Design a protein around this ligand. Structure first.
Ligand code: HEC
Length: 116
């Protein structure tokens, strides 16, 4: 169970989502994605790392939060991230992100999956 494994690696164990996307939180997330993530990721194609538009359809939220917050631990202990390092070659590394920043980015990722 890859989401169970992500929760065991940490740091995040659980997330709170409302019934709908919080649009202001998603906008904050967009800005933070530009700042932290666009250097290596696109929404609709591979780049330095994988395409992200549908990551919330493919992966659980605790996985996505812990890749952002603890990419080194995820690469060391989570089989999906380890396979992606074999595929992509370069590594995602610590960005000194806080949980609230990562939760905003996750909100943005939920939004772009809806935008299609
Ligand atoms: C280049 C230096 C990176 C930065 C900046 C960010 N990511 Fe990344 N990410 C990168 C690669 C090369 C990979 C594959 C694994 C590896 O380390 O080689 C990834 C992977 C992800 C994943 C997993 C995707 C999956 O299909 O499971 C996610 C969810 C992810 N990256 C998210 C993400 C976000 C939100 C970023 C900004 C906070 C971010 N990454 C930065 C390379 C790079």
């Amino acid at each position: 169970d890859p989401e169970a494994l992500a929760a065991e690696i940490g740091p995040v164990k659980q997330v709170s989502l409302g019934e709908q996307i919080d649009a202001a939180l998603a906008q904050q997330g967009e800005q933070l994605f530009n700042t932290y993530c666009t250097a290596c990721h696109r929404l609709d194609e591979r780049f330095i790392g994988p395409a992200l538009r549908d990551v919330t359809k493919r992966r659980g939220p605790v996985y996505i939060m812990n890749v952002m917050l603890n990419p080194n631990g995820m690469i060391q202990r989570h089989p999906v991230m380890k396979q992606l390092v074999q595929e992509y070659g370069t590594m995602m590394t610590d960005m000194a992100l806080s949980e609230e920043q990562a939760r905003a980015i996750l909100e943005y990722l939920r939004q772009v999956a809806e935008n299609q």
